[PDB]
Every structure is written in structure tokens, then in C-alpha cells.
Structure 1
């Protein structure tokens, strides 16, 4: 999964915060992780709102 890849990129970075090659890799990983988490949460919410609306309709 992505969770581990991000955790490990962080562990390698914190060993030598001044290495450009490590920084460039981390920027990319953390960015993708951020987008993934947001997209997932929004989709979950949408499906639950639909489900709730049906019940509210027949109630």
C-alpha cells in the first residue's frame, strides 16, 4: 500500500534532511498520499448521503 511507502520515505529523509535527492522523492510521495486520502474520504461521504436520502424519502 501507499501508507508504508510514505512512512519509509520519511524514515530515510529524517536520517539526512539536507540531501536534495531525498527531498525531491519525499515531496512527490507526500503529495500523492494527500490526494489519495482526500479523494477517498469525499467518495465515502457521497455514498452515505445517497443512502440516507432514500430512507428520508420513504420515512
Structure 2
């Protein structure tokens, strides 16, 4: 949500692409080694994101509940 008046997705496609290459030839060691890395990075990214979004929700809620 914007602060009114204040002046001032690739990893998903990359994982999809690597999956499509791998699915065509599951026995290629080079496609396996590549997919392992893309999937590991995507996993870490999604986790760090969702933890941060919760931490900000809980600070806003604590502020309101302090004056409520």
C-alpha cells in the first residue's frame, strides 16, 4: 500500500524452464545438476519472503493493539 504523496519475477520463469528441459530427458547429469540449483534457490527465496511479510503484519497489529 502506498504512502500517499511520497516520491518513491524471473526466478519463477527460470525454474519453469529448467523443469521443462529436465522432463524431456530425466537421465542427463547436466540437466539434473542444473535443476538442483534452480530449485534450491527458488525454495530459499519463497521462504525468506513469506517470513518477512509476516513480521511486518505483526508489527502493524501490535501498534494498533497498543492504542486499541
Q: Shorter-chain TM-score category?
A: over 0.9
CA RMSD of aligned residues (A): 0.3
Once the two structures are superposed, residues 8-42 of structure 1 have per-residue CA deviations (whole angstroms, 9 ceiling, x without a partner) of: 00000000000000000000000000000000000
Unaligned stretches of 5+ residues in structure 2 = 1-9
CA distance in 2, matches of 1:55, 1:36: 30
**Aligned residue pairs, count:** 59
Larger helix share, 1 or 2: 1
Unaligned stretches of 5+ residues in structure 1 = none
TM-score normalised to the size of structure 2? 0.86
TM-score normalised to the size of structure 1? 0.99
